[PDB]
Write a structure and sequence with these properties.
Strand order of the largest sheet of chain A: 1-2-3-5-6-7-4
Subcellular location (chains C, E): Cytoplasm
Number of domains of chain A: 1
Function (chains C, E): Involved in unsaturated fatty acids biosynthesis. Catalyzes the dehydration of short chain beta-hydroxyacyl-ACPs and long chain saturated and unsaturated beta-hydroxyacyl-ACPs.
Order of helices and strands of chain A: EHEEHHEEEE
CATH class of chain A: Alpha Beta
Oligomer: homohexamer
CATH topology of chain A: Thiol Ester Dehydrase, Chain A
Helix content of chain A: 10-25%
Largest sheet of chain A: 7 strands, antiparallel
Organism (chains C, E): Helicobacter pylori (Campylobacter pylori)
CATH architecture of chain A: Roll
GO molecular function, one term (chains C, E): (3R)-hydroxyacyl-[acyl-carrier-protein] dehydratase activity
Bound molecules: the ligand COCCN1C(=O)/C(=C\c2ccc(-c3ccc(Cl)c(C(=O)O)c3)o2)S/C1=N\c1ccccc1, chloride ion
EC number (chains C, E): 4.2.1.59
Number of helices of chain A: 3
Chain lengths: ~150, ~150, ~150, ~150, ~150, ~150
């Protein structure tokens, strides 16, 4: 019912944890339709130790990962709403990834904004597409299909 | 075969983003077969996911990109540690990836990449990731080598 | 210059992971003031234990981030963007005073450091200012440092 | 109320965890009055990776953090004694820091002794002040005011 | 019985990252022997300092992994795959003798542990064997474990 | 030639680095005879995260590793003294370990003192033995034979 979520609510919905929880705040959310979130990029992240020495560049694949989590938050809330209890036993598997294009490198100090739209969704299978943006510009484009499942 | 110390002399990637442990097969301007061991003792598992260790699909793709990278560096300048150290690799595009089987601690993740097309510093490769002969994922990507 | 990105910052401060808390410098006035910032994201080790389920960027690290900004300020003022000389210097902080924390800092915040030169006499520099998140002051502090030869 | 607490007791009272729990043991404790504790400094701490390369130096701001935590243990035990139950529902916020002076650099192999006395205390607000020592000499001095708040 | 994957291992052993050095149990025989392994990959924090520009999995860790396997063997021999009882027991090692290192272990290797029960009396279990990579012996060791009640 | 060394000297002799450099300081050193050194044990170490949760215990094998490093520093200096040049062209690799007995658990707050005596030395082959002590009490004991090898 809300459209603005902070790190606290994100931890209660997504199963991801450090160092793979790549969504910091949800700024906009329209159930079954779109979501806008963002992750701040800082030099104080471990992934920078090796990507790359003396040249910090946020991995392209982790940007895709960040987008998937945004969509995963959109998918869970659209299904069961904000129910951490239900969410606490679910995980999220990647099914496919297509048409991803990287236009501008993301670096420390960047506010990487995730913009996801629901292209199609069936039960637990959600297919989203959108872009990663920094200062209003598209730094990345991507389409992906993820499935949420109950931890067996 | 090229072992970890050779890989270090070519790829610019370091911990914790160096996801290729050994190169078992290489054919210039053609293909490459390499792999990375998966063990619980990897930091990514603390968060992906707690109680349910699953190697991230995106990192599977990253491992293939790196395998592709080694293939490009060596095809471009051969095994030249000197040239390599001035470069880094940028992901340009990723397409047609599909995950069929989850990778978990104890798995030997094999990368199979063939050159689909290349020009200058821009290389496009495609293939699969395998575990015990079984295809756990396929993908296509285009990377760029630069200064 | 007036805008230094992470690479420029890396060539001036000796600080490295996980103690380099200045991601970018948005403005610098030799001998006057500096405005920089560090993004705060959940993907930082410190949040693992401060605290579980309640990510709150440590106040001591805000102050530290403020000290680093002042250090870049004092140094650039004296020698400008000079990587070679930076390697032979040391910015050792002697005191911290009047520190106030008004509102907590959390993942998703852009922690802006605002520091100015309160006093400069020889090797001793005294800076002061605030850390701000979206125009609102979240913390303040006065710090004194001494410039010196590395060893 | 004890006066000799170990890491096991400390884990049960303070909310801090790795890599921010900077107190290893409590040696002396006088409810509402003073406390003596310490943190061993070893090269095997991640913080030394970047502070600094080739020459390890425990950060001063972190020494102040350790004194604050010592103070917190005193406050908690002062208000509820050793009660892990009510202690789990809390966290400690830094309110102010004053008169901190750094006299001697702290390094790997040092036994950082935290010396703190209560300057003032009302309810959840505790104002403490003292020194951090190593082998009997004062390496740092500081005053701080913390607050214990419901993890609401 | 049969083979256990990391999941099952997590339910018996109390060890967690970065100290759980057994990824899979491919063979177990009550009161007799165990065959397990840990994959060695460059992506392990340990390789940062052992050593720079020269990754070599520590020998004492090869030994730690043999102990964990041996411990796993003794525990399951008495109680089988019983998670509840596992939280009830403590398996620490009293002794370690006859340790020999023959070949360096590096990223890409599959460190296979081969431990057999030499002798056991009550809760004192003595195991011994080798660490193997590609069928060859990279290390040998004998360890004595004591099984106790947690707390 | 000296008998007291600090982490800054240790770093110039041993190649070990975080998180495997387990000797913080050397308080005693007698060529070809013995070495007494120590490593502080603090909760702020990665190892404790999983060994074990809610029960920090410094790994016995790590105590042994620490003893081996001291032996290594001893072996090298006995032969070349404090020589950074040569030190970084050689490596002390261990061939065997015997009679290892763990008597008392090591925990955060402990000062793990390493005591190694030279049992036999002939060229590059060194056999040493000793104990790990905490507050004058033996917590561990072991014997090792090391080989000083070329680094290339
Ligand atoms: C390799 O031997 C292990 C070292 N060791 C222990 O593990 C000891 C007890 C122990 C192990 C695990 C736990 C434990 C306790 C509470 C919890 Cl909550 C957990 C958990 O949650 O995972 C685990 O306690 S004692 C010991 N070493 C020695 C050494 C010498 C004498 C006695 C013990
Ligand atoms: Cl995935
Ligand atoms: Cl990239
Ligand atoms: Cl705080
Ligand atoms: Cl400092
Ligand atoms: Cl070793
Ligand atoms: Cl142990």
């Amino acid at each position: 019912l809300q459209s603005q979520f902070f790190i606290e609510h994100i931890l209660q919905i997504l199963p991801h944890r450090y160092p793979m929880l790549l969504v910091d705040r949800i700024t906009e959310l329209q159930a079954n339709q779109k979501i806008v979130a963002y992750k701040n990029i800082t030099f104080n992240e471990d992934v920078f130790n090796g990507h790359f020495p003396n040249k910090p560049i946020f991995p392209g694949v982790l940007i895709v990962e960040g987008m998937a989590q945004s969509g995963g938050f959109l998918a869970f809330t659209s299904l069961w709403g904000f129910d951490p209890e239900i969410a606490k036993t679910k995980i999220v598997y990647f099914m496919t990834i297509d048409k991803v294009k990287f236009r501008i490198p993301v670096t420390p100090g960047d506010r990487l904004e995730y913009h996801l739209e629901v292209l199609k969704h069936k039960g637990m299978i959600w297919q989203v597409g959108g872009t990663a943006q920094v200062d209003g510009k598209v730094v990345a484009e991507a389409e992906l299909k993820a499935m949420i499942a109950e931890r067996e």
